[PDB]
Amino acid sequence: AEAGITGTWYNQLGSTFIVTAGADGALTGTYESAVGNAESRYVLTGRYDSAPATDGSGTALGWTVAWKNNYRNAHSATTWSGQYVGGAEARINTQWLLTSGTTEANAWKSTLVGHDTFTKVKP
Amino acid sequence: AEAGITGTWYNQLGSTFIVTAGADGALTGTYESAVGNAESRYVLTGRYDSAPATDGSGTALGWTVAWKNNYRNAHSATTWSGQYVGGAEARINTQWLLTSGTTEANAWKSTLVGHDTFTKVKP
Amino acid sequence: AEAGITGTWYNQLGSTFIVTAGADGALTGTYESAVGNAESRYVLTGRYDSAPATDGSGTALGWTVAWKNNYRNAHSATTWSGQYVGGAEARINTQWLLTSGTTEANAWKSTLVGHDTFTKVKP
Amino acid sequence: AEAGITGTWYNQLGSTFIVTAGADGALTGTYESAVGNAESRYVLTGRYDSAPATDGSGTALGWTVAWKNNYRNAHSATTWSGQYVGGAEARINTQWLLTSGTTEANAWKSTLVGHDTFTKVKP
Numbered sequence A, B, C, D: 001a002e003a004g005i006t007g008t009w010y011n012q013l014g015s016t017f018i019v020t021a022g023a024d025g026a027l028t029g030t031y032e033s034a035v036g037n038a039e040s041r042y043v044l045t046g047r048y049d050s051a052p053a054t055d056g057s058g059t060a061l062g063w064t065v066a067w068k069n070n071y072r073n074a075h076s077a078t079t080w081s082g083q084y085v086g087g088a089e090a091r092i093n094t095q096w097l098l099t100s101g102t103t104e105a106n107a108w109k110s111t112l113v114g115h116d117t118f119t120k121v122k123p
């Protein structure tokens, strides 16, 4: 976990995120999305639960990226929830929720759901 | 947004979270869950997209809580994605993803999805 | 269950659905949405698991509505997954997935997620 | 669509489902799950929106399976929402919601979310 999480990860869409897993569960870094109403790097922050594991389970973690930087303001935020699996072919398997700011009338259609798999190799 | 987000919020399950929205999109605080394999306060970190809004839309945001503290280690993490609506009756409407660390065989059933509504009044 | 499910239900958005729960787990009926790219009634079909319950649990069920009828073709379909709780104030609590047909390039943003609560009284 | 949907499909977990897409949007068939609290074949019913497409988009569809048959009663139901893409390598990409019947107290943790990709070849 932690040490193994720190580094650069790539997903199936071509996005990249670099993260540092701190000793006490913190995750800090940047995310660069290959799709969307995103351009450049965005700040990301999250947490992971280690003290994960005498039965080779994954380490649960999650992070958030608000899609605003000095080049774009997409008025939305995405949260990724999943687990890290280390080893030869380590990966982070996730499901994400992307919410856009809407008027109350369109709040029912404000959230998209999807999944992403990240590897240390691209892809 | 930001100023309006800062404070204590309560949801329909009886959980409470106190957060500080920093000038540049950061969200930091603690979460205390009324249900689950949670006991006491857990650290939370997230982001919000302001610079939100000439058409009274909500402010998109998200945060993560790893369910580990000095009393419990639930080997899981939850991410909440939604938007803040201010005013007389301000609220944060969210959808969440709770992922538990599993063995590869049970990874298909590792994530729960739900929704929570937070108000400044309980509830 | 079954008998209790049969009838007209209304949700918080003003939609209405009438369903018949058949003896062997089938659910058939129509749905009329108050929002969206929907107009009039659409056919719905689903299933419920009864033989549900010596510990007052809910009955799990789900149904699908393809948003095409003789007035509109929204090129999308919604599935609702949840459980029925009977009694004085019976309700069906659900989470739904709305998928739109997209080109491969936009498939990552093809699905919306939300939740709806249905009651026998409106609302 | 329709004709192309009819047939046997296999997903990454080893499950199999055979379906018939009827002329007017109906989907009927059986599902056999390789995981879970499932054993044998279960009935499935759903809908698809064709009249799908001068820009090679997918056909939106969804179906439900209640996990009860003459060998098992798992007190749960799963709904799959996604789209069919035909061609050389046709597939059905989905996201699913599995809800279990719970007591009111555990209703917050009643639904699991995941995703499955089905192909005509296994896998």
Ligand SMILES: O=C1N[C@H]2NC(=O)N[C@H]2N1
Residues within 6 Å of the ligand: A011, A013, A015, A033, A034, A035, A036, A078, A096, A097, A098, A114, A116, C108
């Ligand atoms: O890498 C990405 N994953 C997807 N989810 C999201 O929010 N934007 C897309 N980019």
Ligand SMILES: O=C1N[C@H]2NC(=O)N[C@H]2N1
Residues within 6 Å of the ligand: B011, B013, B015, B033, B034, B035, B036, B078, B096, B097, B098, B114, B116, D108
């Ligand atoms: O407040 C809570 N909301 C629910 N989601 C979650 O992760 N635990 C529960 N507690």
Ligand SMILES: O=C1N[C@H]2NC(=O)N[C@H]2N1
Residues within 6 Å of the ligand: A108, C011, C013, C015, C033, C034, C035, C036, C078, C096, C097, C098, C114, C116
């Ligand atoms: O009643 C409705 N619920 C929401 N989900 C959906 O698919 N359309 C909306 N209408």
Ligand SMILES: O=C1N[C@H]2NC(=O)N[C@H]2N1
Residues within 6 Å of the ligand: B108, D011, D013, D015, D033, D034, D035, D036, D078, D096, D097, D098, D114, D116
């Ligand atoms: O094929 C399967 N997909 C998964 N979702 C589900 O409900 N059970 C599992 N089996």
